[PDB]
Design a protein around this ligand. Structure first.
Ligand SMILES: CC(C)CCC[C@@H](C)[C@H]1CC[C@H]2[C@@H]3CC=C4C[C@@H](OC(=O)CCC(=O)O)CC[C@]4(C)[C@H]3CC[C@]12C
Ligand SMILES: CC(C)CCC[C@@H](C)[C@H]1CC[C@H]2[C@@H]3CC=C4C[C@@H](OC(=O)CCC(=O)O)CC[C@]4(C)[C@H]3CC[C@]12C
Ligand SMILES: CC(C)CCC[C@@H](C)[C@H]1CC[C@H]2[C@@H]3CC=C4C[C@@H](OC(=O)CCC(=O)O)CC[C@]4(C)[C@H]3CC[C@]12C
Ligand SMILES: [Ca+2]
Lengths: 932, 79, 42
């Protein structure tokens, strides 16, 4: 047989398998591994059970099913106890309309189901529907383990539930042995010898008081602890052979402790703790200590785990909490983790490296991590990670455990650097991830650390701008002496650079030891008077270091690079305009050639001295030059320097002289546009230089729409008035160039409109002609339909000069509104990349840079990493100050979360739920009075 | 009666022994009379829908279209 | 089921479910009021 009806049944024999049944439950058509199993035994006489036993199953047992997984093992027939359990499952899945569709295996015998369609003998794969001492099968159970031997299936289930109890619970097969328990609603003679075997296989029976035949016969005995038992057994059994029915009860009562009585009218909401109560008496000192709190973790029920630890003779020792946090970590369950750390663990006796290797061993097999470990058994993390909070925070980032990493960040030191560090990993490790489904969660949890790093630093910056400046430039001993700005660069942390604390910190790094509120004109006055450096103007924070704080600062290296480049373009122009005769190169032209060699020697310094890509110190030039020729400026810097080289090579050869001048005039154009890339570091200009490249998508639409209209206008005008000087350079000029200039107010009416030109007899061709006075207007044009050419100009100036130009302004004004936020956000992050690009550059500019290249190359024959230095005791005062402001920040967000309106409505509704749970006790006062 | 709270507690509780035809004609009046919230309840407790959608009952379902509709006449136009 | 959870955990549907549980409280605490009659007979 196979599945059918969408339940998954099969027929088997008694002797078959403990394991190949349960593997065929869990692997094939897998529901889950349970967190317990409540096997229910004891039939009625045929009619309906009592109302409170029905309510014990309604919202006492199946409530504990949907809360804890917890598949129920029953008969399956619609007349035994499986009817009444089947009533409860069918009730509860419509009672709570959300639900989780509780699972219940109805282990039945094959020779009882009367409407057997004999499911499809090839392989048992049918979806075959059932037609609804010959009892049927339900439609309410998720399975039906039909047994082809009501006696045969009993030795199977006790063989089954013993195997279930041997199976461990937890991801990776480690954790607790699963809890199995028999639930004994009242039965018969056979029900007493049923649960004797359960004690022999060590099953914690859970008989219910006030039930009847088999339960209350045993319930009166378990309260009869330290000749009367002759009488009381006969009270529930009018049937004979009382003697072994006496004698087997003491065989049960040899155990006496793998057995508890569900007290009548004392549970039904406490049932989930009474179930919990029976297991501890069962484990209480051999069976793999169940510890009562490790169990509540495995059930994934938080409210049990608090009240167990907050109350109930609170004497929790070390190892009681130690293995409890393992299953809180191995199974995902982050809310249990915060509870245990709130009651405090060691974390120096907890993070022993076996347990970390244990923690990484429970990674899922088909991950991008387990194989990534086995591949290794960002890429340096693989060479660093192998199988008190930082290693634990590292773990939860690696396995994409979101709320675990959000918590482990909160319990450790180094809040800002590990928030930037978490953003660094999850952007790197998403690129190292094959599939893009989980990379959406990997990138979302990177934004959540981007939120907390920006939020916590903005608190620390408004606290003390000086002491939070030291937060970035601290020598972080992680990552081989990393810096938090360097951490934010490699993370591509655009939101972290965008905040006003980091941006005001960048100006202070920009004006390095020169008091960044200094004016600009005083820097100009001190650049062109180095005597004026030591004066009443620019303030700073040995007169030789005072010299080097000025000329080593990135604004003066910038202004050195700007002054020396405006003088390059002034030398370039004075060569190009007045010193460029076909003679061999003179004084200033050779000075220009050396100047642009240094420009090229300064171009290879960025090339062989150059994370969202490779790591620092790649040392193979197929990455360093590939990342060089990827900057859009270098591409401009090399096009400039290569056609300077073309313009000089063509100049020096005698034939190609005018082509060498022509290439150098376009070469001035490209060196001057590189003036834009230099001033994008400016706060006033820079965010607007980055805008004007976002405008190119609208220029290209305009240039498309105009060019189509310029072909349309230009050929139709050149076709209507037919010039007689129709050379292809002049035809392609009156078609394109002359209409293009009409957009800019150069409208040659005298060349297109015949009524404005005289000399109307200028061609022997038939028709009437007229002479336009323009030089490239044709010798004579036609005057056939020159009403149209004049009309067709009017349509041109309307479309081009009014429709196209003013719609381009609407397109610029729109996309300036969109990209203003995002390109300023992009410029903020780009800014620090340009601050330290001048800080690492030598202090001497382009023409005099050869001094600082004959100093660097003489360094090799004799053989910017920004980090402020401070003492370790002043360094730990920083992290102590900053871990206070993390705690003052997490507790501030926790109060704002609790005092939110969405969480008062949660806490009000749960207190009305607490009212009705306790006012329902008051209702049962009527029964308390009716007995009175 | 168009009262939902009765229909849940009748079906969730009270000696729950509902058979086939007890649910079959119940969903008809849940469909013929508009009442969609009763429909979700019965499908939540499960119907056949292969023994429920017999083509007499679909023709029964279309027969309860309102007379002055743009559908009943549109059927009668197509009839 | 994801939209059904977001509908139930909405604030507009907690206020519906809170008010109906206070309505359930008063319907059941009104039973407790008629305890005075149950005591006055006693
Ligand atoms: C081709 C010509 C312009 C030859 C250059 C003549 C130079 C001797 C002098 C005349 C005035 C100088 C300028 C005076 C004002 C400054 C502002 C200065 O801006 C900054 O460095 C700080 C702004 C920031 O924070 O980014 C750049 C250099 C600059 C343009 C100087 C560049 C070189 C200039 C043009
Ligand atoms: C059909 C005819 C007109 C030939 C087409 C020529 C244009 C497509 C090209 C040639 C020169 C280009 C310009 C050369 C200088 C630049 C500066 C550039 O700004 C930057 O480079 C800033 C650097 C950065 O943001 O990364 C923006 C485009 C722009 C105006 C270009 C706009 C498009 C131009 C006109
Ligand atoms: C901006 C978008 C909408 C397209 C506009 C393209 C024109 C403005 C460009 C492309 C073709 C170019 C022309 C190709 C042919 C000539 C004729 C030429 O006149 C000569 O005979 C001198 C030497 C020669 O090229 O033969 C002068 C340059 C000119 C106007 C070129 C400069 C401007 C033109 C018309
Ligand atoms: Ca460059």
């Amino acid at each position: 047989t196979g599945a059918g009806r969408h339940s998954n049944f099969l027929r088997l024999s008694d002797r078959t398998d403990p394991a190949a049944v349960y593997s065929l439950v869990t692997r094939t058509w897998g529901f889950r591994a349970p967190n317990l199993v409540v096997s229910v035994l004891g039939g009625s006489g045929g009619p309906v059970l009592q109302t409170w036993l029905q309510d014990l199953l309604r919202r006492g047992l199946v409530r504990a099913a949907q809360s804890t997984g917890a598949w129920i093992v029953t008969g399956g027939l619609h007349t035994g106890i499986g009817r009444h359990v089947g009533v409860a499952v069918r009730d509860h899945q419509m009672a709570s309309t959300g639900g989780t569709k509780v699972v219940a295996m109805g282990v039945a015998p094959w020779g009882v189901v009367r409407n057997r369609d004999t499911l499809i003998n090839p392989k048992g794969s049918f979806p075959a529907r059932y037609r609804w001492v010959q009892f049927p099968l339900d439609y309410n159970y998720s399975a039906f383990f039909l047994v082809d031997d009501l006696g045969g299936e009993n030795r199977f289930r006790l063989r089954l539930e013993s195997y279930i109890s041997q199976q461990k619970t937890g991801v990776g097969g480690t954790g607790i042995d699963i809890p199995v328990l028999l639930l004994l609603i009242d039965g018969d003679e056979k029900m007493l010898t049923r649960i004797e075997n359960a004690t022999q296989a060590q099953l914690p029976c859970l008989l219910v008081a006030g039930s009847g035949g088999a339960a209350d016969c045993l319930a009166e005995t378990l309260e009869d602890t330290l000749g009367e038992a002759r009488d009381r057994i006969r009270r529930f059994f009018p049937k004979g052979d009382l003697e072994v029915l006496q004698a087997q009860v003491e065989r049960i009562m040899t155990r006496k402790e793998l057995l508890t009585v569900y007290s009548s009218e004392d549970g039904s909401e406490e049932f989930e703790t009474i179930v919990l109560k029976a297991l501890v008496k069962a484990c209480g000192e051999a069976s793999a200590y169940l510890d009562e709190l490790r169990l509540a973790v495995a059930w994934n029920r938080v409210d049990i785990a608090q009240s167990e630890l907050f109350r109930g003779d609170i004497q929790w020792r070390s190892f009681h909490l130690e293995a409890s946090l393992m299953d809180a970590l191995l199974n995902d369950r982050p809310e249990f983790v915060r509870l245990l750390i709130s009651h405090g663990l060691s974390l120096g006796h907890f993070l022993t490296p076996m347990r970390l290797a244990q923690l990484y061993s429970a990674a899922p097999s088909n991950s991008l991590i387990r194989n990534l470990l086995d591949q290794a058994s960002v890429g340096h993390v693989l060479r660093m990670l192998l199988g008190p909070w930082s290693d634990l925070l590292l773990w939860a980032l690696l396995l994409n455990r979101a709320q675990m990493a959000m918590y482990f960040w909160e319990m450790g030191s180094n809040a800002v650097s590990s928030a930037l560090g978490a953003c660094l990993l999850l952007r790197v490790m998403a690129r190292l991830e094959p599939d893009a489904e989980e990379a959406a969660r990997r990138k979302d949890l990177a934004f959540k650390f981007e939120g907390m790093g920006v939020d916590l630093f903005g608190e620390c910056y408004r606290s003390s701008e000086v002491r939070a400046a030291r937060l970035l430039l601290r020598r972080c001993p992680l990552w081989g002496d990393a810096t938090c700005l360097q951490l934010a660069m490699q993370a591509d942390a655009r939101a972290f650079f965008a905040q006003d604390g980091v941006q005001s910190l960048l100006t202070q790094k920009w004006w390095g030891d020169m008091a960044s509120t200094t004016p600009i004109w005083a820097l100009v006055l001190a650049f062109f008077c180095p005597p004026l450096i030591y004066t009443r103007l620019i303030t700073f924070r040995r007169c030789l270091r005072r010299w080097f704080h000025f000329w080593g600062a990135p604004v003066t290296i910038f202004m050195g690079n700007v002054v020396s480049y405006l003088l390059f373009l002034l030398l370039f122009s004075r060569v190009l305009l007045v010193d460029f005769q076909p003679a061999p190169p003179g004084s200033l032209e050779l000075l220009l050639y050396f100047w642009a060699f240094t420009l090229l020697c300064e171009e290879l310094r960025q090339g062989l001295s150059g994370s969202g890509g490779p790591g620092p110190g790649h040392a193979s030039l197929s990455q360093r030059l590939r990342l060089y020729l990827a900057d859009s400026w270098n591409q401009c810097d090399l096009v400039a320097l290569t056609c300077f080289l073309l313009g000089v090579g063509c100049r020096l050869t005698p034939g190609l002289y005018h082509l060498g001048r022509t290439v150098l005039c376009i070469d001035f154009m490209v060196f001057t546009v590189r003036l834009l890339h230099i001033f994008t570091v400016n706060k006033q200009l820079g965010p607007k230089i980055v805008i004007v490249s976002k405008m190119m998508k609208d220029v290209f639409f305009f240039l498309f729409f105009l060019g189509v209209w310029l072909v349309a206008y230009g050929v139709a005008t050149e076709g209507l008035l037919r010039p007689r000087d129709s050379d292809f350079p002049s035809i392609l000029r009156r078609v394109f160039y002359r209409p293009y200039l009409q957009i800019f107010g150069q409208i040659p009416q005298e060349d297109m409109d015949v009524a404005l030109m005289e000399h109307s007899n200028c061609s022997s061709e038939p028709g009437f002609w007229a002479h336009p006075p323009g030089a490239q207007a044709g010798t004579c044009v036609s005057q056939y339909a020159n009403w149209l050419v004049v009309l067709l100009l009017v349509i041109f100036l309307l479309v081009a000069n009014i429709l196209l130009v003013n719609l381009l302004i609407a397109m610029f004004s729109y996309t300036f509104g969109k990209v203003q936020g995002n390109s300023d956000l992009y410029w903020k992050a780009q800014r620090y990349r340009l601050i330290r690009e001048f800080h690492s550059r030598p202090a001497l500019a382009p023409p005099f840079i050869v001094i600082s290249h004959l100093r660097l190359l003489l360094r090799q024959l004799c053989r910017e990493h920004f980090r402020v230095y401070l003492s370790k005791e002043a360094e730990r005062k920083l992290l102590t100050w900053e871990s206070v402001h993390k705690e003052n920040f997490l507790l501030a967000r926790a109060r704002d979360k609790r005092e939110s309106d969405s969480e008062r409505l949660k806490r009000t509704s749960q207190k009305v739920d607490l009212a009705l749970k306790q006012l329902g006790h008051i209702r049962e006062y009527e029964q308390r009075l009716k007995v009175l």
